[PDB]
Design a protein around this ligand. Sequence first.
Ligand code: 75A
Length: 298
Amino acid sequence: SVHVPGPHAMTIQELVDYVNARQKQGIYEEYEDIRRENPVGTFHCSMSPGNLEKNRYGDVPCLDQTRVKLTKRSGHTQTDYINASFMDGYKQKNAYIGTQGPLENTYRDFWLMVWEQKVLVIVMTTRFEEGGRRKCGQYWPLEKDSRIRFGFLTVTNLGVENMNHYKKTTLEIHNTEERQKRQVTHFQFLSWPDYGVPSSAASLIDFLRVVRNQQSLAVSNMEPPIVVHCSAGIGRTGTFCSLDICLAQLEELGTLNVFQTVSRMRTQRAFSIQTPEQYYFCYKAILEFAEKEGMVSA
Ligand SMILES: CC(=O)N[C@@H](Cc1ccc(C(F)(F)P(=O)(O)O)cc1)C(=O)N[C@@H](CCCNC(=O)c1cccc(I)c1)C(N)=O
């Protein structure tokens, strides 16, 4: 895993001084320096003929080095391509798969990836459309007992539950070619605002705990990667994963490094963290968490 504790991790105390010394604008500038970096890797496969139509955004290709390859087959007029990247987690290889919001022409590829990678949990961070911007196709059966066939794969809704900040749906994936069935939990975070970032991170951190516990539970009963996606799979997705990583390290060693985490993440899921606001949000969310945990003195 590229996410190892340190070198140079910070304690809550040090993070406080770090943020106060730079302020909001200083953090924005720091983000702009990360954005300046020349990507580590290439995008030849993503920008090639046949796969271009498989990207929701022409300016958001995935790295060749870390892309998730589909074990396709002969003359069916398809490929092994899907805009999705393997992402390490804190001291964990391939803890996540950051990907774009599925397109109609990639629904089957998305589920083929879920099946092939033995995914147990899917995390959706947006709605189908926000502010008039399409951000994700309706790739799963919405209501209980409804089902959708994707060739040899059938997906059935076994039940939905609406929470205050997220909705949970249980799905059954039936592979008719291998005559096997699996249960997958689909989570949709509902509290990310249409504009800017969450005013408070409490909801998102609580949601993170819900996802963590469900993955743990699913794993014990079956580690497979958690599929996390947003429109382009780099903004809210990178924020969710960067927070999970830092919080994980904060729990285990009482230290963290936002800069390091985001920089390392962008070598696996290129362009992770798309705005200076989201970068700043990472720092603020951690400080807000530390205060809620009674770790901060004024
Ligand atoms: C113009 C356009 O449609 N692109 C968007 C793509 C996009 C990114 C992020 C989101 C998001 F925040 F909602 P989500 O949370 O779902 O991720 C949505 C859409 C954009 O703002 N453009 C980006 C571009 C990203 C940087 N890439 C490159 O520019 C690039 C491309 C190819 C090769 C190379 I080297 C670099 C921008 N301008 O901020």
